[PDB]
Write a protein that binds this ligand. Sequence first.
Ligand SMILES: [Zn+2]
Lengths: 52, 148, 191, 171, 121, 67
Amino acid sequence: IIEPSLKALASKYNCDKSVCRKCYARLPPRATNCRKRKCGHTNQLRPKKKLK
Amino acid sequence: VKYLYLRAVGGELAPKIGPLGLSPKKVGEDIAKATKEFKGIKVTVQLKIQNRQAAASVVPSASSLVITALKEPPRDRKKDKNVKHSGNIQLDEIIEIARQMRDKSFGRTLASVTKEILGTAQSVGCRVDFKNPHDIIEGINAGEIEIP
Amino acid sequence: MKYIQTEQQIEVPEGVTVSIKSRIVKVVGPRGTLTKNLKHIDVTFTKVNNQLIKVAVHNGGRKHVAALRTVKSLVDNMITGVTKGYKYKMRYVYAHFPINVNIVEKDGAKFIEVRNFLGDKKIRNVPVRDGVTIEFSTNVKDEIVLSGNSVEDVSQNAADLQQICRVRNKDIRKFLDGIYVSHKGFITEDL
Amino acid sequence: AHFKEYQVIGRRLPTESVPEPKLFRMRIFASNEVIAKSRYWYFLQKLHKVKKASGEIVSINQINEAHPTKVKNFGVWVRYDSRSGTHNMYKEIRDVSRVAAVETLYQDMAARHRARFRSIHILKVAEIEKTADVKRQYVKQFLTKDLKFPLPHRVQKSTKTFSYKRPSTFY
Amino acid sequence: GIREKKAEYFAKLREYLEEYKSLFVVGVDNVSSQQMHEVRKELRGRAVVLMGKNTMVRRAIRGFLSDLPDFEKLLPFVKGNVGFVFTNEPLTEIKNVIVSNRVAAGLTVVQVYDNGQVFPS
Amino acid sequence: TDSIVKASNWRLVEVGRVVLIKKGQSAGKLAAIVEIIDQKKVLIDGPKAGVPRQAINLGQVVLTPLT
RNA sequence: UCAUCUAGACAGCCGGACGGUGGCCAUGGAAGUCGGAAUCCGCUAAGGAGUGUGUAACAACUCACCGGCCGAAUGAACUAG
Ligand SMILES: [Zn+2]
């Protein structure tokens, strides 16, 4: 156990992201398009897979 | 001191609520049955007031219940659990009486409005021999005085 | 679509003085002074009444009028950073191994050293950019405060200290250990 | 080319069963009379059952601009053929005359949609008599009160291949 | 459509200003719809309560400015969340009812305009 | 002290601005800008110097400091 | 092509987001939110017989709607260079 607030603060940077389906890039959670050129700024995004 | 409100089909969970008040389930059911002896065939809101010794049961007025009662209904066992769709006559006087019975309880906006709301409550009931319920309510000013 | 005139404003408080020759901005305030080269962005500045300065671009494209609001935000950040200052609070996060953070001096350069992050024998040293002061805060457990005038220097130093504590070859959703910035604000916040 | 506007009036050839046909009239932007009459017969073959062998042209007249020194705003309705289909567009141009407005229209369509003269159909062009009926921002930008703007970065082209001082782009 | 609903609002407001000499400006903060509904019912007989967008109201008053010129004084007070009470009763009785009803953890009367005269009250 | 900027003003184009025709049939006379067509061209008139009232591209004239 | 718009639009904060009614069937329960149908009034400035989270069912939170600040264009779907 870390602490509940400290787990929230660490998960803000480590777990509450989104993943581009084409190029696996770690993206902002409210993003609409990937920031990478190689996937062509696609809008195929998924949430980052949580535990539990 | 404590008031508990439940919707109960008449003639009859209750125990879970009763345990907090330390009241026998059977005793409560019997009291409720007597109260709904008037509103038994169909579900009606029941108010139980607890004096810390015993609970007194009364049936609070509800628009749907009053409307359902007004539509004449053959008694239904409910073992069948049929759709039991409700078909009703215009019963204009009964609805006005129901509006008066509400007596603008919970602040219905107007006496006429209370009746209009009562008409809307008959989503379930046909509420007219030949018309959609409350379709003509806007059209006809008749019975505004009766509701008051 | 070639917007022929777009224009932003910056408000100058009573304590500061801003000097703009060609595109070099100098802001002088109570906490000190800051400077900025902006010869890459191609705008024009105009003082109105010694507490208002308009910045404008004429016949600009979409990217160019985006850069106009960007440079307004940069010079306004400079003004509010020399008036109120900038303070970043970061918290230490560990499961088992406590992170031991001190300040050392190789050749007088004010290094921040990080020991025992997930129990390793490696010592992580991050340098400190000039103008940034670091205080290990009391009365809140495991909290470090970086303060300064430049938001760029303070936030970059905080980011370097955050990035130096990354976990390798493990599931980072479970191994949440690190040093993370929890608060960003001013030194004289709610002034 | 540099366009001119003509009215072209024509009709069918008169027969004994029907003398005096109905004398249709159209306004054509074209470089000259030959192209104007060709475009007239093109649009009448698109509209009515007639062709050049079966009809005749009774009049062609150049219509020059009534006020060539008034600055107008024109709304232009256009058909064009793209590479996949046919589309309608409405573009509005602030300019001093109708022929110059359709010249800048042809340049604008060729620049922004790669549409050629053979693909563009001019449905209509009309002066917008009132402001706030202007619907495009790129022309509504120039209708503001006391419009003024500078011209940064003056480049002066030189006649000599060598210049003896570093030039200045002040204007 | 939107304009039509709006036009009706302008008309009713004009009628209300004419109908009642006494006007109460009431500021509502954190007052629930239920709290508001109860107040309306209590005052249905003697008072009319009107709620509207301020931008909409100011234009209306300016539009109706030529008639009822004294109502112009009310415009500075209109700023901020406001409600209009039009009542036959002259002053205190209405005010007492509004403040007392539904105070929970709160209606306040910011200003009173009666007969061309404004009272901070 | 007081805030100091370099103003960097130059020769706005508006109505009443006097221009010098650089090249063309006039080619060296003065005109006055009557109205602004768009970003690149204006309607000018030079009635004392004999310049006819016309629309002209802004690359064919030079703006003078006179207004 | 649809909509909204100085009678205040879209973002961002803040407040309300209510009664008839736990509308009618059906379930051991399901009260806006397991489903089947209907989907109407009042008070309104405004609030769906409910957009989600949500509990055994509640309760609770949030929505789309209206309001204060902001003062001017913006949202959705589609087409092609
Ligand atoms: Zn990607």
